[PDB]
């Protein structure tokens, strides 16, 4: 039993814990969210196929680590699903050939939000997997640890729904122009969704986000969002109806709006949050 990652990097086998860096592409699925499919990331083989067969299981106590430590879900191991953190030893995967074969493991998370996410930066711990290796000819029985680290920055969805982008930047035309905000949401199965805006506002209507531009800021103006011509105040939930597997636009447009006193020339910036809720 000897393994390497997708880019060909050796994983030292057994003895001390190994830190294994993998690419992940998290996604919402029906009833659970993929955190990482390791079957595309870890490939193993047997250097003595003619005479030895290797067996590898995933042991009890395997679990998420780091920022995912508090979450639970499932592990798909060799085509079957089990609770994660693991509460029993899985059946084995067999390695006989010198030809590489995937380690057939994918880790899933039980949704707890509507469209939330947890950022995982490259270099961060994802999971701690405990493996047990045996064979078909002697008593060798050894357990060892693979600490799975992110090779790339991702956001793990924690809900039933996911968004086109977690961070969106738009540029208005020169005042008094407006611009659509490209932002959509979809769900793994149909869900009834709403959303609301968060941020600091400047007006009696709680609907003009303050201009927080750092350099040479304009005075007397802020940013106001509309949907089909209707102003959306902060912290007032908008309904999206039922959102299925195809993306549904939030329908947002950005505008400038006056906050009082004279409008003066300069830069404008507003940072506005969007939060989804089930309805």
């Amino acid at each position: 039993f000897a393994c390497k990652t997708a880019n060909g990097t050796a994983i030292p086998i057994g003895g001390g814990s190994a830190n294994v860096y993998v690419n992940l592409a998290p996604a919402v699925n029906v009833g659970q969210n993929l955190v990482v499919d390791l079957s595309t990331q870890i490939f193993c083989h047997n250097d003595y196929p003619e005479t030895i067969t290797d067996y590898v299981t995933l042991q009890r106590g395997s679990a998420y680590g780091g920022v995912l430590s508090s979450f639970s879900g499932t592990v798909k191991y060799n085509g079957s699903s089990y609770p994660f953190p693991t509460t029993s030893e899985t059946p084995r995967v067999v390695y006989n050939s010198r030809t590489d074969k995937p380690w057939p493991v994918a880790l899933y998370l039980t949704p707890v939000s509507s469209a939330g996410g947890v950022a995982i930066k490259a270099g961060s711990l994802i999971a701690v997997l405990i493996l047990r290796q045996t064979n078909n000819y002697n008593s060798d029985d050894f357990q060892f640890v693979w600490n799975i680290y992110a090779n790339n920055d991702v956001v793990v969805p924690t809900g039933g729904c996911d968004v086109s982008a977690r961070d969106v930047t738009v540029t208005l035309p020169d005042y008094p122009g407006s611009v659509p905000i490209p932002l959509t949401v979809y769900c793994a199965k149909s869900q009834n969704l709403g959303y609301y805006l968060s941020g600091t506002t400047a007006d009696a209507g709680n609907s003009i986000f303050t201009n927080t531009a750092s350099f040479s800021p304009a005075q007397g103006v802020g940013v106001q969002l509309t949907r089909n011509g209707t102003i959306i105040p902060a912290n007032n939930t908008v309904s999206l109806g039922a959102v299925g597997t195809s993306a549904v636009s939030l329908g947002l447009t950005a505008n400038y709006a006056r906050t009082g006193g004279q409008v003066t020339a300069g830069n404008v910036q507003s940072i506005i949050g969007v939060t989804f809720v089930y309805q």
């Binding site: 961070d167 930047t169 540029t171 208005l172 005042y175 905000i181 830069n267 910036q269 506005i272 969007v274």
Partner: peptide, 13 residues
């Protein structure tokens, strides 16, 4: 929040 929108603009005289 779930998404952060950064809106940039400019007032020109």
């Amino acid at each position: 929040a779930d998404v952060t929108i950064t809106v940039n603009g400019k007032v020109v005289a």
